[PDB]
Design a protein around this ligand. Structure first.
Ligand SMILES: Cc1cc(/C=C/C#N)cc(C)c1N1CCC(=O)Nc2cnc(Nc3ccc(C#N)cc3)nc21
Lengths: 543, 401
């Protein structure tokens, strides 16, 4: 059938005309098949033959297993068709789904060919079956239904099905139906008798619109759906002696996927191997830490884990745990500890960061996910003391706000690992540091002078103004006692260090951090350079 | 009869993805939008419309309102609403003693929108967990939030306001987007009475917050007053002055700098020379007075920066060329994102009153944090443009009070 529904007006892009690609000549078996196929389609209404007035043409092919498929190459018509509203904005996530008592799935056969094409647009879908050795005119046809391979077909189909279903939905809100491509999945909380009664009204409501039409484990979209739980579809980690780049990329992918429900999956040590430019076929020996992570992953996957579905009447609880190395892991549940979903956060927003900054940005990411999946933020449980956090975000310059949360003692806990003094330290040595770099030679001198008369100038190769100014601070921290005042003219270095970094990609910065943790008091001050600020000009001299 | 609205040459409509919304806000919009559909102000659209602008609910009042982010559409019609049919901005509004802001957005629903333009006004109410397809709509009437709306309505507006202006020639009435700014020099009780009469005039046409811009004074860069002076205090003073030197012409520093001559311990109290006290004096006079040689340019975007100062206080500058500050202010007094969101609205309002433009904001916050939360406190009906930045740590203290 061809649905009686109204058609969707289609137009080409402004200033553009429909296609006129020439029909490559075909072998005689190919065109014979195309003649067989096009007369079956013509009799069912899917196509119609046309006069040679129509100047439009799109090439057609055929390929074969022992029966033949018609393939129309809509590349040029697609390039000239208007853009459409994108078909889906996102996939429903299992953890957002409600528990259902009875689920059956139904598949639309003849999906696109059951939906009419805008009569004003059919002229451009014209194609031509050529003659044998392209002697005589060929048989010209056009589509009356949505052709497969045209860029409007997914949009207009899914839209047609929404208009068709919206009566039955409003006359039956309790029932849920999911449209994806040809698929109709239908769920309800009715008893398996009265439920199969409602599926028939749906079928009969479908056939009145020209759409003719299973077991608990529905393998869908990578997931395994059951009526009362979900999980990821089975994860098999290969047992290889040699790992290729392509093997590890696929493993990182399955693990990333498995981490939606399997808590605590770690992948960093596996990802570290992919860094480099090596070919897909090259074998990478597993490092010691990578084979340690593969071990923990194999164990986490040992016994099946499932996820539960969402009860809209209950709060969501999100728990986060630090796994070190900037890897975070989280679980969302409504009754402890029956998880709706798990995940991991391991990004690096910036070059230098601290656990408090990392934990906040993991909170934001879980929060956005929550609004997508359930439409509300969860109540958080965080491995950070309420006062560690109050300390940090009131003194820090960026704004923040994490929603309702509670401390939960699941070590490791998030700490600030040092605190810069707010006032200069009396009876502590004042270092006036400074770094510089001649920008053609790429040589630099990092140095300091002291109010107690000490001086020092080390020389660096392979450096920049930025790196030397951090070397000069590193020096002052090496050579000083537990308490120390430092005066730099590098806003660069002051910005990094006043952020209380925890970790960095710069092992220089990491050395400075290990110094600042060992100290007991450190005051850091900035003066402008070349303004002649006492000590500043003298270590500027020495450099 | 509709006014044909055309986009800038060779520009397409907005294709801006809808941000995720919470259950309570999706429910609010679904009520609002079925009601507007009955009344015919919007109509469902099909997949042949590829355009989208995002939509949100605010609460300004105890009733959800609908807010459409037309920032992208406004950028793409900007020839139309600014040069071809611009509303002139009166220089007198910033002088008036009282300014009341009134919402007249509901006027735009009277007016049909050019039938060949309604496709660019498309928006989607989305679905929790994407379980259902988005409800899609387009406007038929002049939409609130679109800068084309006041442009098209300005002929009808001056007709509505014609009697009231004739009878109160000392009252300034400026229209920006969905708001009427009404400025008078009257005593506050007389002022409110005049606003009450003006609501009556509007009320005869389907049209049902008090600023004192006179009391908007610049927040000058403040130099500490002190008994003793450590070298740390003078260093922080030279740094704060030398940077102020880049804005205010005439700041001098070198007399201070020779109080710091050797490599002195930071905590040692340095005696002040009397030419130093002479110079802190001379500098304070400059920093109190407005910047010399900085003028608004109607052709250049306004920039606003905001620095968090801790303890619920925030500083801000408005400028078109960095360090040429047209305006510097503070804003004060719970929640960092709530306060910033209040600060942006305040600075935008002042920016509409003073220039007829909203500034582009440099926000000191994580983009994800901001986009998550700003709707929860946003109560204006426009939206300014914004970037996200990392506040230069020195700048923070150079504007501290
Ligand atoms: C019904 C369905 C099916 C699929 C795929 C099936 C395959 N393959 C995908 C979605 C998104 C839904 N949808 C329909 C849309 C809607 O609006 N709401 C929904 C609410 N709750 C559920 N839960 C649920 C519980 C248990 C099972 C099982 N077994 C399946 C589903 N499903 C919903």
């Amino acid at each position: 059938p061809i649905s009686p529904i109204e058609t969707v007006p289609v137009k080409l892009k402004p200033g553009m005309d429909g296609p006129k690609v020439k029909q490559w000549p075909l072998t005689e078996e190919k065109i014979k098949a195309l003649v067989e196929i096009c007369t079956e389609m013509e009799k069912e209404g899917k196509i119609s033959k046309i006069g040679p007035e129509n100047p439009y043409n799109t090439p057609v092919f055929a390929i074969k297993s022992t029966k033949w498929r018609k393939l129309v190459d809509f590349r040029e018509l697609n390039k000239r068709t208007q853009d459409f509203w994108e078909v889906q904005l996102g996939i429903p996530h299992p953890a957002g789904l409600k528990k259902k008592k009875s689920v059956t799935v139904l598949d639309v056969g003849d999906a696109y060919f059951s939906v009419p094409l805008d009569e004003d647009f059919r002229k451009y879908t014209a194609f031509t079956i050529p003659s044998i050795n392209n002697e005589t005119p060929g048989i010209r046809y056009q589509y009356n239904v949505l052709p497969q391979g045209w860029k409007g077909s997914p949009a207009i189909f899914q839209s047609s099905m929404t208009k068709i279903l919206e009566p039955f939905r409003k006359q039956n809100p309790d029932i849920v139906i999911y449209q994806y491509m040809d698929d109709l999945y239908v769920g309800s909380d009715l008893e398996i008798g009265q439920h199969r009664t409602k599926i028939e009204e749906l079928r009969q409501h479908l056939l009145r619109w020209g759409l003719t039409t299973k077991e608990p484990p529905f393998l869908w979209m990578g997931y395994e759906l059951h009526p009362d739980k979900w999980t990821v579809q089975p994860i098999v980690l290969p047992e290889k002696d040699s790992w290729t780049v392509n093997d590890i990329q696929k493993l990182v992918g399955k693990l990333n996927w498995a981490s939606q429900i399997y808590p605590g999956i770690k992948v960093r040590q596996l990802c570290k191997l992919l860094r480099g430019t090596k070919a897909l076929t090259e074998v990478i020996p597993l490092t010691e830490e990578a084979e340690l992570e593969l071990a923990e992953n194999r164990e986490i996957l040992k016994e099946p884990v499932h996820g539960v579905y969402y009860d809209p009447s209950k709060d969501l609880i999100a728990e986060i745990q630090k796994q070190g190395q900037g890897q975070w892991t989280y679980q969302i549940y409504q009754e402890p500890f029956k998880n709706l979903k798990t995940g991991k956060y391991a990004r690096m927003r910036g070059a230098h960061t601290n656990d408090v900054k990392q934990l906040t940005e993991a909170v934001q990411k879980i929060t956005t996910e929550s609004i997508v999946i359930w439409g509300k933020t969860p109540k958080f449980k965080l491995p950070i003391q309420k006062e560690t956090w109050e300390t940090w975000w009131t003194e820090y310059w960026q704004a923040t706000w994490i929603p309702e949360w509670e401390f939960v003692n699941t070590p490791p806990l998030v700490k600030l690992w040092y605190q810069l003094e707010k006032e200069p330290i009396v009876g502590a040595e004042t270092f006036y540091v400074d770094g510089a770099a001649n920008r053609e030679t790429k040589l630099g001198k990092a140095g300091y002078v002291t109010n107690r008369g000490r001086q020092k100038v080390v020389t660096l190769t392979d450096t920049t103004n930025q790196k030397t100014e951090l070397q000069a601070i590193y020096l002052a921290l090496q050579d000083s006692g537990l308490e120390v005042n430092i005066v730099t003219d590098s806003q660069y270095a002051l910005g990094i260090i006043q952020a209380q970094p925890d970790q960095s990609e710069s092992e220089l910065v990491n050395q400075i951090i290990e110094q600042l943790i060992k100290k007991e008091k450190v005051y850091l001050a900035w003066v402008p350079a070349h303004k002649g600020i006492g000590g500043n000009e003298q270590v500027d001299k020495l450099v | 009869e509709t006014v044909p609205v055309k986009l800038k040459p060779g520009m397409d409509g907005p294709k801006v993805k809808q941000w995720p919304l919470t259950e309570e806000k999706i429910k609010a919009l679904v009520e609002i939008c079925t009601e507007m559909e009955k009344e015919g102000k919007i109509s469902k659209i099909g997949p042949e419309n590829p355009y989208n602008t995002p939509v949100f609910a605010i609460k300004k009042s105890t009733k959800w309102r609908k807010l459409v982010d037309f920032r992208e559409l406004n950028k793409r019609t900007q020839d139309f609403w600014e040069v071809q049919l611009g509303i002139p901005h009166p220089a007198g509004l910033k002088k008036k003693k009282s300014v009341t802001v009134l919402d007249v957005g509901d006027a735009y629903f009277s007016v049909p929108l050019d039938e060949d333009f309604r496709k660019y006004t498309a928006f989607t109410i989305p679905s929790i967990n994407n379980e259902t397809p988005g409800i899609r709509y387009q406007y038929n009437v002049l939409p609130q939030g679109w800068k084309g709306s006041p442009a098209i309505f300005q002929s009808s507006m001056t007709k509505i306001l014609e009697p009231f202006r004739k009878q109160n020639p000392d009252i300034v009435i400026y229209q920006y987007m969905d708001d009427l700014y009404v400025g008078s020099d009257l005593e506050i009780g007389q002022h409110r009475t005049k606003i009450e009469e003006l609501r009556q005039h509007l009320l005869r046409w389907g049209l049902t917050y008090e600023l004192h811009p006179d009391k908007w004074t610049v927040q000058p860069i403040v130099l500490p007053e002190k008994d003793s002076w450590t070298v740390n205090d003078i260093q922080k003073l030279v740094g704060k002055l030398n940077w102020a030197s880049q804005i205010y012409p005439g700041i001098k520093v070198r007399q201070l700098c020779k109080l710091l001559r050797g490599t002195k311990a930071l905590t040692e109290v340095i005696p002040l020379t009397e030419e130093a006290e002479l110079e802190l004096a001379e500098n304070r006079e400059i920093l109190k007075e407005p910047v010399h040689g900085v003028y608004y340019d109607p052709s250049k975007d306004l920039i606003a920066e905001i620095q968090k100062q801790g303890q619920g206080q925030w500083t801000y500058q408005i400028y078109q060329e960095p360090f040429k500050n047209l305006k510097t202010g503070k804003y004060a007094r719970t929640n960092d994102v709530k306060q910033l969101t209040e600060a942006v609205q305040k600075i935008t309002t002042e920016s509409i009153v003073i220039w007829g433009k909203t500034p582009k904001f440099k926000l000191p916050i994580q983009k994800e944090t901001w986009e998550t939360w700003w709707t929860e406190y946003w109560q204006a009906t426009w939206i300014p443009e914004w970037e996200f930045v990392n506040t230069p740590p020195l700048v923070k203290l150079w504007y501290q009070l």
